[PDB]
Every structure is written in C-alpha cells, then in structure tokens.
Enzyme design. Structure first.
Site, PDB file in Angstrom:
ATOM      1  N   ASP A  25     -21.361 -52.250  30.765  1.00 24.48           N
ATOM      2  CA  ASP A  25     -22.085 -51.217  30.047  1.00 24.48           C
ATOM      3  C   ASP A  25     -21.197 -50.256  29.256  1.00 24.48           C
ATOM      4  O   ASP A  25     -20.640 -49.304  29.802  1.00 24.48           O
ATOM      5  CB  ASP A  25     -22.923 -50.464  31.139  1.00 24.48           C
ATOM      6  CG  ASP A  25     -24.011 -49.595  30.580  1.00 24.48           C
ATOM      7  OD1 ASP A  25     -24.007 -49.272  29.373  1.00 24.48           O
ATOM      8  OD2 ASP A  25     -24.881 -49.219  31.387  1.00 24.48           O
ATOM      9  N   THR A  26     -21.134 -50.451  27.941  1.00 24.53           N
ATOM     10  CA  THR A  26     -20.309 -49.595  27.097  1.00 24.53           C
ATOM     11  C   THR A  26     -20.933 -48.180  26.873  1.00 24.53           C
ATOM     12  O   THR A  26     -20.251 -47.250  26.456  1.00 24.53           O
ATOM     13  CB  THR A  26     -20.011 -50.273  25.729  1.00 24.53           C
ATOM     14  OG1 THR A  26     -21.235 -50.519  25.028  1.00 24.53           O
ATOM     15  CG2 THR A  26     -19.297 -51.592  25.941  1.00 24.53           C
ATOM     16  N   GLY A  27     -22.214 -48.037  27.185  1.00 19.24           N
ATOM     17  CA  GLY A  27     -22.881 -46.760  27.019  1.00 19.24           C
ATOM     18  C   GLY A  27     -22.785 -45.890  28.264  1.00 19.24           C
ATOM     19  O   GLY A  27     -23.352 -44.803  28.311  1.00 19.24           O
TER      20      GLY A  27
HETATM   21  C1  LIG Z   1     -24.553 -44.650  33.639  1.00 20.06           C
HETATM   22  C2  LIG Z   1     -24.576 -43.165  33.394  1.00 20.06           C
HETATM   23  C3  LIG Z   1     -23.238 -42.513  33.504  1.00 20.06           C
HETATM   24  C4  LIG Z   1     -23.229 -41.318  32.674  1.00 20.06           C
HETATM   25  C5  LIG Z   1     -23.838 -41.636  31.294  1.00 20.06           C
HETATM   26  O1  LIG Z   1     -22.907 -42.265  30.406  1.00 20.06           O
HETATM   27  C6  LIG Z   1     -24.706 -42.821  31.851  1.00 20.06           C
HETATM   28  N1  LIG Z   1     -25.230 -43.703  30.769  1.00 20.06           N
HETATM   29  C7  LIG Z   1     -26.503 -44.045  30.568  1.00 20.06           C
HETATM   30  O2  LIG Z   1     -27.416 -43.919  31.388  1.00 20.06           O
HETATM   31  C8  LIG Z   1     -26.781 -44.636  29.123  1.00 20.06           C
HETATM   32  C9  LIG Z   1     -27.493 -43.597  28.237  1.00 20.06           C
HETATM   33  C10 LIG Z   1     -26.725 -42.312  28.122  1.00 20.06           C
HETATM   34  C11 LIG Z   1     -25.443 -42.246  27.555  1.00 20.06           C
HETATM   35  C12 LIG Z   1     -24.817 -40.995  27.401  1.00 20.06           C
HETATM   36  C13 LIG Z   1     -25.513 -39.860  27.828  1.00 20.06           C
HETATM   37  C14 LIG Z   1     -26.738 -39.909  28.494  1.00 20.06           C
HETATM   38  C15 LIG Z   1     -27.366 -41.153  28.634  1.00 20.06           C
HETATM   39  C16 LIG Z   1     -27.743 -45.867  29.218  1.00 20.06           C
HETATM   40  C17 LIG Z   1     -27.088 -47.047  29.906  1.00 20.06           C
HETATM   41  O3  LIG Z   1     -25.997 -47.417  29.114  1.00 20.06           O
HETATM   42  C18 LIG Z   1     -27.885 -48.326  30.128  1.00 20.06           C
HETATM   43  N2  LIG Z   1     -28.843 -48.294  31.244  1.00 20.06           N
HETATM   44  C19 LIG Z   1     -28.187 -49.222  32.203  1.00 20.06           C
HETATM   45  C20 LIG Z   1     -29.055 -49.408  33.449  1.00 20.06           C
HETATM   46  N3  LIG Z   1     -30.431 -49.800  33.107  1.00 20.06           N
HETATM   47  C21 LIG Z   1     -31.062 -50.952  33.613  1.00 20.06           C
HETATM   48  O4  LIG Z   1     -30.351 -51.814  34.129  1.00 20.06           O
HETATM   49  C22 LIG Z   1     -32.554 -51.159  33.540  1.00 20.06           C
HETATM   50  C23 LIG Z   1     -33.053 -52.392  33.069  1.00 20.06           C
HETATM   51  N4  LIG Z   1     -34.357 -52.660  33.109  1.00 20.06           N
HETATM   52  C24 LIG Z   1     -35.241 -51.805  33.632  1.00 20.06           C
HETATM   53  N5  LIG Z   1     -36.508 -52.322  33.810  1.00 20.06           N
HETATM   54  C25 LIG Z   1     -36.743 -53.333  34.873  1.00 20.06           C
HETATM   55  C26 LIG Z   1     -37.675 -54.495  34.400  1.00 20.06           C
HETATM   56  N6  LIG Z   1     -38.928 -53.956  33.780  1.00 20.06           N
HETATM   57  C27 LIG Z   1     -39.886 -55.013  33.383  1.00 20.06           C
HETATM   58  C28 LIG Z   1     -38.552 -53.172  32.578  1.00 20.06           C
HETATM   59  C29 LIG Z   1     -37.674 -51.941  32.977  1.00 20.06           C
HETATM   60  C30 LIG Z   1     -34.780 -50.553  34.085  1.00 20.06           C
HETATM   61 CL1  LIG Z   1     -35.892 -49.426  34.776  1.00 20.06          CL
HETATM   62  N7  LIG Z   1     -33.456 -50.246  34.021  1.00 20.06           N
HETATM   63  C31 LIG Z   1     -31.053 -48.854  32.194  1.00 20.06           C
HETATM   64  C32 LIG Z   1     -30.216 -48.749  30.909  1.00 20.06           C
HETATM   65  C33 LIG Z   1     -30.900 -47.811  29.964  1.00 20.06           C
HETATM   66  O5  LIG Z   1     -30.796 -46.588  30.099  1.00 20.06           O
HETATM   67  N8  LIG Z   1     -31.633 -48.456  29.007  1.00 20.06           N
HETATM   68  C34 LIG Z   1     -32.397 -47.801  27.953  1.00 20.06           C
HETATM   69  C35 LIG Z   1     -32.947 -48.880  26.979  1.00 20.06           C
HETATM   70  C36 LIG Z   1     -33.569 -47.044  28.577  1.00 20.06           C
HETATM   71  C37 LIG Z   1     -31.535 -46.882  27.107  1.00 20.06           C
END
Ligand SMILES: C[C@H]1CC[C@@H](O)[C@H]1NC(=O)[C@H](Cc1ccccc1)C[C@H](O)CN1CCN(C(=O)c2cnc(N3CCN(C)CC3)c(Cl)n2)C[C@H]1C(=O)NC(C)(C)C
Lengths: 99, 99
Positions: A25-27
C-alpha cells in the site's frame, strides 16, 4: 518483481514464524497489521484512514519478511480490514512506482 | 517517471478544468476525491477502510489527466481527507509496483 495493478497487490509476509497475506500500500504511511501477539512493549498511536481515526499499538524493531526480503521496522497493530505494508517498509525493500 | 516512496507519492491531476494534488495509492481499489461538482448523474455508495465507512457519490466514466496521461473511469466524490487515485485508474496509465 514487477507488479501490475489489475488485481490487489497482495503478497505473502512472514512474521513471528507465520505466513500471512498483506497488501502493498503506497497510500499508507505506516504498516498496520491485524490483531496478533508481538514481542516487547508498545507505545500508543492514533492513525487516520478514510473513515476516521483509530487507536493502534506501536511495536518497534520487528522483523518481517516481504517476498523473501527481510525488513526490520515499526509495525502498528489494530483494527484493520487487511494487513497493510506501508511506505516505512516499502522503502526498505526498495519499492518504487513506475509509469 | 520512477517515483520513490520516501515521501507520499503526490502528483498533479486535472479534472473538470481544475488542477489538484492526489495520492497514487496501490492499496485503494477506487479513486476518491474531495467534494466537488461533476457533470452527469451519480449513485450513492459507502466505501470503507481504516476508521470506518463514508458516504460518497459515484460518477461513472470521468476523464482525468494524471501527469499528462489521460484516463477514463469511475470517480467517487465525498469527505475524504486526501484525493486518492486508486487501482481502477492507475492501471490505465500503466502504473506498476517494482522491487
Ligand atoms: C493505513 C493508514 C496509515 C496512515 C494513513 O496513511 C493510512 N492510509 C490510508 O488509510 C489511505 C488513505 C489516507 C492516506 C493519507 C491520509 C489519510 C487517509 C487508504 C489506504 O491506502 C487503502 N486502504 C487499505 C485498506 N483497505 C481495504 O483493504 C478494504 C478493502 N475492501 C473493503 N471492502 C470489503 C469488501 N466489500 C464488498 C467492499 C468493501 C474494505 Cl471495507 N477495506 C481500505 C483502503 C481504502 O481506504 N480504500 C479506499 C478506496 C476507501 C480509499
């Protein structure tokens, strides 16, 4: 390896002698793992994602192998939907984005 | 270009005339952008991640220019803390993860 993004970039990680699945996860600034038992003391940390902030436990100097690449760093443990490998460990294994 | 992960992978994107900063996120399945007006009809959707779920408006087949490269796809608009470019659009510009 070169990894395309048509599918979720899930890889196998080895931590505490166990194999687990984790997302490249690069984000994510940090590496966040699902509930498990890790050695040593922990410090508190608040991290914010898409839906808000959560409380996690911070463990330092934890060994974790990602695709055969050993990394040693900070891992956070808390309520996460999947195991996440963030930038702190991606930089250690030499990961980059290309296009 | 070859983007390293020492810092967050932010890039300039162009959407609807406006220029915005956005995160190249391999962990994100979808592309979520901060509140803005986009033409056409939308559909309500709930997306989640760490911290929980948020309500967004789903706009289909929107054109975005990510670093000069054009891409078409579904864009979700809602209360996200940062603009994120997910896998649905990253694949279109030929983005890969390498290590
Ligand atoms: C990790 C933290 C550390 C500190 C921050 O850097 C931080 N980063 C993040 O949180 C960043 C955003 C951010 C960056 C900077 C500042 C604030 C926020 C998002 C992250 O990179 C990705 N994140 C990974 C986990 N993930 C899943 O596996 C997942 C996959 N699928 C799901 N499902 C299950 C089946 N269903 C049918 C459908 C829904 C569900 Cl619920 N969940 C959700 C996904 C996410 O958020 N996706 C989006 C489309 C909503 C954006």
């Amino acid at each position: 390896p070169q990894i395309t993004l048509w599918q979720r970039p899930l890889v196998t990680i080895k931590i505490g002698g166990q194999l687990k699945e984790a997302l490249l996860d690069t984000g994510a600034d940090d590496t966040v793992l699902e509930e498990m038992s890790l050695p040593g003391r922990w410090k508190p940390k608040m991290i914010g994602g898409i839906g808000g902030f959560i409380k996690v436990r911070q463990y330092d100097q934890i060994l974790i192998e990602i695709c055969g690449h050993k990394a040693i760093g900070t891992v956070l443990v808390g309520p996460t939907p999947v195991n996440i490998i963030g930038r702190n460990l991606l930089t250690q294994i030499g990961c980059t984005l290309n296009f």
